[PDB]
Amino acid sequence: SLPAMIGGVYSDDNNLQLEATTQFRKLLSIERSPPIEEVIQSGVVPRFVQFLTREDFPQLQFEAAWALTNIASGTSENTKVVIDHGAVPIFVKLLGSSSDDVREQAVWALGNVAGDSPKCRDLVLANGALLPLLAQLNEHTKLSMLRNATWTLSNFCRGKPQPSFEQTRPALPALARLIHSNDEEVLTDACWALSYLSDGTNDKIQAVIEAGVCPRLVELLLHPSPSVLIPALRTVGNIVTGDDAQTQCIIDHQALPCLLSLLTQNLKKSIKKEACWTISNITAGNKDQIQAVINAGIIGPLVNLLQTAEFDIKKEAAWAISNATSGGSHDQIKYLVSEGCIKPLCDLLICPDIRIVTVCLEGLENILKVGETDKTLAAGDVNVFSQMIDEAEGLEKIENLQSHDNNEIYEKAVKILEAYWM
């Protein structure tokens, strides 16, 4: 019935225009491979874009917006054709429509176009879609629109190179409010949007923390759904990459006992990997920040992972442990040793990841300095931690690291041996 459809689309009668646009929308609304390319070649894309400007016929507007959204849902070439026919500024105008159905369709259309590539996202942002998108969001916004707007916002923040922070800055108060929802879809999309905004320099993190999201993000670390957990953990993780004061905003809302529960409960390897990485950037902090990790009871489970977990988790547990030896006090480091961090740190000296070997060598060197200070204070004839590194088969591994091709590993191995085994 395609000739009657093209004919109906290309007619002047309001009844024929609607029935044929509805038929194309239903043809493109099928869940098993829609004929997007074929609907384009029938030349109805420019006529559907003309139907968007029919303010007197909001129902035709809606079907045309649906069909175009499904055309824009296809390959990169299909989205480009929708762009070429100037639909992007018209969908931005449709965000001010009196019809909620049309406004909702305009939102999903813009999210689809923006989701295609960073270039398409920048064109949507350049046509000023952000401010009218936020203006139609308030106390009486229905869940369907809250779900579409949050997804679209996430597509505006997604992609590498990241969008301009000044371009996406107005979305921060809205996302701060949206993460207080109980809806699993809104929480997912809001958290992903905040994980993109939070990734970058510390001035970006500062605007994220000033939006007031830290308390609620920590609560979302306990969300039973991994769809919400994963982007919330990513956002908390990005915030703790910041300075001591920014990292403290996460610690102040009991994030460390939450992070610990992710390590002990039976979750996916990638979840635990992210949780260890987050902890590693906390132990990269000041003495009080390392003390909060200790106070939470994290060292015990962290040392076990460093010793027994899958390599991707061990890698991150090594950074967490060694970062604490870098910024920790004499006693804090003695507490890491009492929790048995020496053997698992030594065991990784033979791992094929060069950076982890060097992370473990620096952690062990900082441990040896504490043991050397104890040897000077007690006027002892032996460095306790030298014998512990020897007993763990660490000394033989360090001795063998002198035969290594990597200059960072080699110079560290020689420095350690000349200082504690001359």
């Binding site: 970058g200 993780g237 990005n238 990459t241 950037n281 990269a284 970062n323 030896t325």
Partner: peptide, 9 residues
């Protein structure tokens, strides 16, 4: 020397 804060990738 190698230890400290790490940004995402």
């Amino acid at each position: 020397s190698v230890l400290g804060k790490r940004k995402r990738h």
